[PDB]
Design a protein around this motif. Structure first.
Motif, PDB file in Angstrom:
ATOM      1  N   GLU A 254      -0.532  -3.208   0.819  1.00 28.32           N
ATOM      2  CA  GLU A 254      -1.541  -3.051   1.851  1.00 28.32           C
ATOM      3  C   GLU A 254      -1.055  -2.255   3.064  1.00 28.32           C
TER       4      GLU A 254
ATOM      5  N   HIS B 179      -0.705   1.411   1.078  1.00 27.61           N
ATOM      6  CA  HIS B 179      -2.147   1.638   1.178  1.00 27.61           C
ATOM      7  C   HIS B 179      -2.763   1.989  -0.182  1.00 27.61           C
TER       8      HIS B 179
ATOM      9  N   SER C 190      -5.039   0.386  -2.216  1.00 30.79           N
ATOM     10  CA  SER C 190      -6.491   0.254  -2.379  1.00 30.79           C
ATOM     11  C   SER C 190      -7.140   1.509  -1.878  1.00 30.79           C
ATOM     12  N   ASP C 191      -6.581   2.011  -0.793  1.00 28.25           N
ATOM     13  CA  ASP C 191      -7.185   3.125  -0.105  1.00 28.25           C
ATOM     14  C   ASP C 191      -6.992   4.430  -0.872  1.00 28.25           C
ATOM     15  N   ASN C 192      -5.817   4.585  -1.455  1.00 27.94           N
ATOM     16  CA  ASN C 192      -5.525   5.794  -2.190  1.00 27.94           C
ATOM     17  C   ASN C 192      -6.179   5.832  -3.554  1.00 27.94           C
TER      18      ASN C 192
ATOM     19  N   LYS D  39      -9.216   4.449  -4.046  1.00 25.66           N
ATOM     20  CA  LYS D  39     -10.609   4.757  -3.734  1.00 25.66           C
ATOM     21  C   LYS D  39     -10.849   6.261  -3.523  1.00 25.66           C
ATOM     22  N   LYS D  40      -9.897   6.949  -2.902  1.00 29.23           N
ATOM     23  CA  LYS D  40     -10.045   8.376  -2.619  1.00 29.23           C
ATOM     24  C   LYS D  40     -10.050   9.214  -3.897  1.00 29.23           C
TER      25      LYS D  40
ATOM     26  N   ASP E  49     -11.827  -5.268   6.747  1.00 26.26           N
ATOM     27  CA  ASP E  49     -10.993  -4.255   7.390  1.00 26.26           C
ATOM     28  C   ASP E  49     -10.529  -4.669   8.779  1.00 26.26           C
TER      29      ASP E  49
END
Length: 188
Positions: free
Chosen positions: A37, A41, A43-45, A47-48, A86
């Motif tokens: 997290e 990161h 989850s974020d990468n 999603k992109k 978030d």
């Protein structure tokens, strides 16, 4: 091939029908989850790089941290119901693993208050049956794949990410390999 079952992912013997497209499990007590997290990161990468029309789900688990672990699974349901994921993910991770200032359900609650969720609104959500079924959903998803460890990511209820089979020399490169693997499985 470049992607091989048993190498960047494993296939479930026991595929799970109707499962969320991309399903991630974590615990606020889980040290790699903290890395995933705050440092990586993940989850974020992921999603992109996910195709259009692919929704992302993240669930907390009970099997770490005993009593507080279950409180956190209920708190995460509150976070999901109020749509404030978030705003609490970072202070919850840090309160549990960095400052170790989360020791009780009240301390979890303080994190939400400090993040600006009204006490009235948190307590109402905490006690709601809309939060009880969201807790039920989190537990059932984890039970469906016989989950005994976190962090974990499942795609289309039939593939499980296998991060041990990726290089960690470079944190950046590990993350893209992970994300690219999810995209591959997604398109499978």
């Amino acid at each position: 091939a470049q992607y091989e079952d048993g190498k960047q992912y494993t296939t479930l013997e026991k595929p799970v029908a109707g499962a969320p497209q991309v399903l991630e499990f974590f615990s606020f007590f889980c040290p790699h989850c903290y890395q995933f997290e705050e440092v990586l990161h993940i989850s974020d990468n992921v999603k992109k790089k996910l195709p259009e029309g692919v929704k992302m789900t993240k669930y907390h688990v009970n099997f770490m941290g005993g009593d507080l672990g279950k409180d956190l699974t209920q708190a995460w349901a509150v976070a999901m119901a109020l749509g404030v994921e978030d705003k609490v993910t970072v202070p919850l991770f840090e309160g549990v693993q960095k400052t170790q200032t989360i020791r009780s359900a009240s301390d979890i609650r303080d994190v939400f208050i400090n993040a600006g969720i009204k006490g009235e609104e948190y307590d109402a959500a905490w006690n709601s049956f809309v939060v009880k079924s969201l807790v039920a959903q989190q537990e059932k998803a984890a039970a469906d794949v016989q989950l005994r460890g976190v962090p974990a990511m499942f795609v289309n209820g039939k593939y499980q990410l296998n991060p041990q089979g990726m290089d960690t020399s470079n944190m950046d490169v590990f993350v893209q390999q992970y994300a690219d693997t999810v995209k591959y499985l997604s398109e499978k």
